[PDB]
Amino acid sequence: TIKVGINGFGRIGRIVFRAAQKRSDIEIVAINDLLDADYMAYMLKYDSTHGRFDGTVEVKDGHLIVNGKKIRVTAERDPANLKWDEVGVDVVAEATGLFLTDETARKHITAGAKKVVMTGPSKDNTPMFVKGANFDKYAGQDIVSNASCTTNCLAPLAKVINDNFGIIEGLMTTVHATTATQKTVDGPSHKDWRGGRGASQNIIPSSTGAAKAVGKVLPELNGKLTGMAFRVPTPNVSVVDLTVRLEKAATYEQIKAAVKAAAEGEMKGVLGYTEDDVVSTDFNGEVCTSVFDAKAGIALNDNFVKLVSWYDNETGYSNKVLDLIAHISK
Amino acid sequence: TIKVGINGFGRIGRIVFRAAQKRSDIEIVAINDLLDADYMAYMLKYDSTHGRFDGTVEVKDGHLIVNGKKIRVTAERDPANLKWDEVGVDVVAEATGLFLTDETARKHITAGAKKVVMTGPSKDNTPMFVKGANFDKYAGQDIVSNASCTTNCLAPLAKVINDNFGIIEGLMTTVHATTATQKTVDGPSHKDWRGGRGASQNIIPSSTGAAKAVGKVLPELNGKLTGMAFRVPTPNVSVVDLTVRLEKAATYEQIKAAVKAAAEGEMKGVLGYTEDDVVSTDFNGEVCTSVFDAKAGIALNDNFVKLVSWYDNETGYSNKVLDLIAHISK
Amino acid sequence: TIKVGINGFGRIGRIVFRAAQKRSDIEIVAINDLLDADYMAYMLKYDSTHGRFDGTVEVKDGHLIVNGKKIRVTAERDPANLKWDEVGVDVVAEATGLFLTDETARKHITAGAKKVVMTGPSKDNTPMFVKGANFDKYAGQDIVSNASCTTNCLAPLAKVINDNFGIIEGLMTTVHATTATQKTVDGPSHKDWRGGRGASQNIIPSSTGAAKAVGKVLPELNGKLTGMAFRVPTPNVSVVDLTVRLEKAATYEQIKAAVKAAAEGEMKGVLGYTEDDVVSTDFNGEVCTSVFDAKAGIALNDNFVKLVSWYDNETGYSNKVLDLIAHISK
Amino acid sequence: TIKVGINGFGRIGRIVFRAAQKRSDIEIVAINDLLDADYMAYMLKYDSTHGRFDGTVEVKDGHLIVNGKKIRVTAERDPANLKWDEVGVDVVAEATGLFLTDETARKHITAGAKKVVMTGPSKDNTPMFVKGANFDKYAGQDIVSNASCTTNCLAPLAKVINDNFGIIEGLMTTVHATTATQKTVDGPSHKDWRGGRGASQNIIPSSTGAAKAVGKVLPELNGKLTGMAFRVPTPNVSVVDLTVRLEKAATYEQIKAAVKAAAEGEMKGVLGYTEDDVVSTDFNGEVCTSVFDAKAGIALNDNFVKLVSWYDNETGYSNKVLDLIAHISK
């Protein structure tokens, strides 16, 4: 099995931990964050969004014991001190949000790990990979990025649409759940003023590079997409709303049939498909990073259409972080 | 002054009542609904969304007395019994949602009123009017409709964009506040399954004819727009997100300048314009039916752009119901 | 196995259905409500609060098929037409809220069922039973009531406290999740004005007979308790806050030890006990009708103390409805 | 007029600023916080909870100009550098939460201010004052504290009840709105684990010294009260639920009449009284620190009763901070 260390025990670090438990190719052996072991046990055991941990959690002498396995718990602010080799870590899941460049994330390799996967879009030229879009493009690099939750939703859908019908241009909106970077009441957020306003009171317009970033994992779509977001008062699960102009005329039935084929074929497990009367909570826990909502979309004509796709911005992304860890460890 | 009777004391009936108080051309003299006078006084006095009534409210012997004026209170299920002439009603504000055809709403005229304004889109060919779009088209009809809250947001913005640059085609999404037709928890809604799901838990996809209905008040845009909606867990204020292809190339600065000109000129008071870091609560109480958010929109190129416009789906619409009452009473 | 029919497919009807699936002594064979079979399948399959149904749901020719079993689906407004004997129903779970008297609920027996369990407090002298309090008092009656969700929380806790230390007098508050009887925005509720105000905007004071009703299942506490409620913007899970004067002086450690003993002994499975840092979502899905929160309570002195106990007002109650069905079928 | 400087522009700093504008005895002349002037202008202009600022706000060259008055804007981390005398500050409103001891808050006097009012409970023996309870006890001190929002609700009510009937012992619960110290989703809060859980998802048990602190401003009640809190998903307005044993037997009508007398007499303006069907939003903007809810309370007998009182935990407290500034400047 691949021995994984988690750096940062935020939302993504903890949901990656939970998703790792169902896997037989990957073992979390260590967690680093500025939290005591008994508190980490608490955050793992109880989740407001995903329920109680399915398994056993205990602290025996500053060591986490999860389903019988000792997890090493450290609290290093500098990843060079992490001594990953002492616990045998093959790949670090870098989930603090603070080491999104090669210079910073390579400190993990200095500390004894073989490879690193950033759980967010890289801030330099570190390559990005989205499952369903460009995993096959991986060329042995030792530091990679899994891009963002919204890019993971948009890129697989956009590849299906573009491969079958040709995207001339698209604009996307994501109606996005509240996240940890928001405020409970109007508070300070000096780099993003709207984002300081009270999260449960407001529809909050927000920026995103996810649509532009699609052009990085799918360079044929480079320059052809952009978008924005609205944050709304839900705790989890988001939806993209993709408005595209198509080169080849395609009825809505043809679009539906092409997405369903992908979801049952090449993109099984990353792209999903539904025709039911779903709402956002129906995707709480969803492992597909992109579930096409057939009934919700609408076409003006055969070359101009709005497509709707759901994603659990915690769970889907976290599972594909693991998929990327497995893929680069092959 | 124009003597107005309100039929139905729901959200729209009560916010129309409140907005009428600041006006000197219009007096509410009667309210019909299946509510006792003391309960009507209660619903008027306290509003979770808009605060305490600014004025005095008392019940003296089954008569509402609001800022010193007797309001006649009745509870007729059939509008033919309403005897509007006994209290001198010129125009009925028909706000029950149940009499959206000519056959049904004309019962108000049978009962002694001169004209009727439906506070929702008509279900037959009753003409619709949206301020900023086609009030000038009013040709003396005695039963009219003020269309819907979302059409009132979309149509003025779409006229500016189309008059300056030519809309080839557009698709719109409205991120819409929760409304009275939704459920607090998962409950029955047999004509709209998604709409029964718990309103505060969910992003809820929803249908709307508002974009198509733009082609009725602005027939030059007929067939050129459609859209859908998402209901989200906020109590009031909605936003349209309009993705349009433009005939004439127009930079985002040119679009901004053209909307701002309209908001300071022909469409002053219906179309607003802002460049601040607004969120939805900043428009709670907004009287403009459409406030353009300059910072939130985004263009892919000079012919393909996404435009953002805010509306208080209670307050703006309610004020324009009054504007339509005044206009047809001229 | 006991063959059960469900009358009414609201929140309680559906959660009773889900809880029945894990049981081997009880089979739901029929559901009556004014809903088509395909819509019932939809409400069963997707739950905003409890996630996707764990099993299979299909409609084959107006018949529900759930985990392989045909469920008879009818839509009778009058229970005398229900023909329960045609599908072999031993006990009806009466969960519409409309037949809470002997005269009305006996229509189920007229229709071929042996016994009836009302899923709410009876409105006449129909006996009430709360597990942990007075199931042993059941004397063969053919129509019974499982009281209310809040009585099911309060009565087991109050019996432990009173048996060990003697309750002189108590006042309780329940901070209660939003329910189906509330409104999404300020709307009409003529029998309960506060309860019409928008559920997600407000703390809403509310009445309850649950504390008084404790004196019916535990007649030694008759006249010794009363209380009220606040409804708050959460979709599920409530908490009682019980302030009692004690006859025998008892430290908080003694109270803790006595509740823990009950939860591990006589009241195992109905009364739970925790010392963790729980919040309300940690009890979403809880089967115990009363989980004592050791850390949250506080004593002023050894004879005056405030006790805190959690309950999933959907899940716990629904499971004990089944327990009562099993108990009276013995 | 009294020249006031505000240190810290959080929720309390900004609502104190807004409340100061209606006053003619007090002028805010300076604000210190780690925010640029244009951002301070933004936070003042738009409030999710209290609406748009009623007045004019502009930035002219790093100076705030509010309703025509220059406000000095600084960003000192150490209050000794604040040079309050350069702008003529008589009293500092210390609202950062970081200088709640005499040693730390006296740095404001070192910097040229005459007196200091802490906008929270002091952490040393700095005296506390609650209007309606012990303002008359002020003995000329130059550093004081206005205690906490919840003590400001509880102490005036408890004085009325104790003066008329004698409180033997009381236990209180406050159902409290979400605050800035909570998290939007499950996040880190190592000193208070429950308080890290997602604020909009949860009822969250919480500690409070407000009931004990009543015994400091009203020493006759020392040792006679304690309590706890639940945080719930509302953005503003809280309620105390006070369970008391009374020495002198008193019907609920007698309790009502005694609170109403206080609210119309000695405690006019701090203690309010209502018999309407209010919910929490009806007190958004409330200036009374304690509004007795006559209909919501309940008595078990003439010596054991539960009393309900509302407070806007932002607005009421902020106004009494100003009242305390005025009182000590007399």
From Swiss-Prot, chains A, B, C, D:
UniProt binding sites for NAD(+): 11-12, 33, 77, 119, 313
Q: Which InterPro entries match?
A: GlycerAld/Erythrose_P_DH, GlycerAld_3-P_DH_AS, GlycerAld_3-P_DH_cat, GlycerAld_3-P_DH_NAD(P)-bd, Glyceraldehyde-3-P_DH_1, NAD(P)-bd_dom_sf
- Residues bearing the modification N6-malonyllysine: 330
Which pathway does it operate in? Carbohydrate degradation; glycolysis; pyruvate from D-glyceraldehyde 3-phosphate: step 1/5
Q: Which GO terms describe its biological process?
A: glucose metabolic process; glycolytic process
- Which residues are connected by disulfide bridges in this protein? none
Which Pfam families does the protein's record reference?
A: Gp_dh_C, Gp_dh_N
Site annotated as Activates thiol group during catalysis: where? 176
Single GO cellular component annotation? Answer: membrane
Coiled-coil ranges per UniProt = none
The GO terms this record gives for MF are: glyceraldehyde-3-phosphate dehydrogenase (NAD+) (phosphorylating) activity; identical protein binding; NAD binding; NADP binding
- Of which family is this protein a member? Belongs to the glyceraldehyde-3-phosphate dehydrogenase family.
Q: Which NCBIfam families match?
A: GAPDH-I (TIGR01534), PRK15425.1 (NF011954)
Task: Spell out the subunit comment.
Answer: Homotetramer.
What's this protein's name?
Glyceraldehyde-3-phosphate dehydrogenase A
To which species is this protein native? Escherichia coli (strain K12)
